């Protein structure tokens, strides 16, 4: 049982995916606002609002993020040619989602040091099908649940480590959960 929902709502691109629709409720609200509640420590999901295509933009977000277990709050997106999947992790629960990636330095932006990581996913699901693509991570040390993200500063930092970003695909402020519980209401602009 899977469910994937995308489109434009309140003037913003939205995306929601889960492999357990019965334990996760995603709600589109006005403008760049969305809410997500998940319970029962069952299922995997990723959802949020943003843009398609993305860009080197300043992403402002605010709201409430109340995970209970494995979960993260991140700017998340893709580029094409080359195919790249990227995470700017602003907050997370009991697991660092960067786990297993290779350390690749630091960048200081938006009031905190971010630890950079790179990783390769081999024959894994992607926006273009099963592919081998590169991953970039920036993980904020000073966890937060509201503020501004200078995506271009991360894009520049990543380009000094490995291949530069390609043509932007979608770009969202994502809430994620993996067999856990929580609630969140966020607003992007």
Q: Which residue has the tokens 């994937």?
A: 4
> What gap in Å lies between CA 116 and CA 135, rounded to an integer?
11
Catalytic residue among 85, 90, 106, 128: 85
* Residue listed under structure tokens 């937060």: 144
Query: How many C-beta atoms surround the C-beta of residue 41 within 10 A?
Result: 14
Q: In terms of Cα–Cα distance, which of 174, 178, 161, 29 is closest to 90?
A: 174
Q: How was this structure determined?
A: X-ray
User: C-alpha angle 51/119/108, rounded to 5°?
Assistant: 65
SS (H, E, C) the chain: CCEEEEEEECCEEEEEEECCHHHEEEEECCCCEEEEEECCCCCEEEEEEEECCCCCCEEEEEEEEEEECCEEEEEEEEEECCCEEEEEEEEECCCCCCCCCEEEEEEEECCEEEEEEEEEEEEECCECECEEEEEEEEEECCCCCCEEEEHHHHHHHHHCCCCCCCEEEEEEEEEEEECCEEEEEEEEC
Residue among 188, 150, 174, 187 nearest 67 (CA): 174
Q: Domains, the chain, ranges and CATH?
A: 3-187 (2.60.120.180)
Which of 90, 106, 128, 176 is flagged as catalytic? 176
Structure tokens, 131: 């592919």
Is 90 annotated in the active site? no
Closest residue by Cα to residue 146 from 62, 33, 48, 44: 62
- Separation of alpha carbons 189 and 23, rounded Å: 28
Tokens representing 123? 């024959």
Calpha distance 58→183 (Å, rounded): 25
Q: Which two tokens stand for residue 19?
A: 């492999």
- CA 74, CA 149: separation in Å to the nearest integer? 10
Most distant pair of Cα atoms in the chain: their distance: 43
């Amino acid at each position: 049982r899977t469910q994937s929902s995308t489109g434009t709502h309140g003037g913003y691109y939205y995306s929601f995916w889960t492999d357990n629709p019965n334990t996760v409720t995603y709600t589109n609200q006005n403008a760049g606002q969305f809410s997500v509640s998940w319970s029962g420590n069952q299922g995997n999901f990723v959802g949020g609002k943003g843009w398609n295509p993305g860009a080197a933009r300043t992403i402002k977000y605010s709201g409430t993020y109340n995970p209970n277990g494995n979960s993260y709050l991140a700017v998340y997106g893709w580029t094409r040619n080359p195919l790249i999947e990227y995470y700017i992790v602003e907050n997370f629960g009991t697991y660092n989602p960067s786990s297993g990636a290779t350390a690749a330095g630091e960048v200081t932006v938006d009031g905190s040091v971010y630890d950079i990581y790179t990783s390769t996913r081999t024959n894994a699901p992607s926006i273009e099908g099963t592919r081998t693509f590169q991953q970039y991570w920036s993980v904020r040390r000073n966890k937060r649940s509201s503020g501004s993200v200078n995506t271009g500063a991360h894009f520049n930092a990543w380009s000094n480590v490995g291949l530069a970003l390609g043509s932007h695909d979608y770009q969202i402020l994502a809430v994620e959960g993996y067999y856990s519980s929580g609630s969140a209401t966020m607003t992007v602009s």
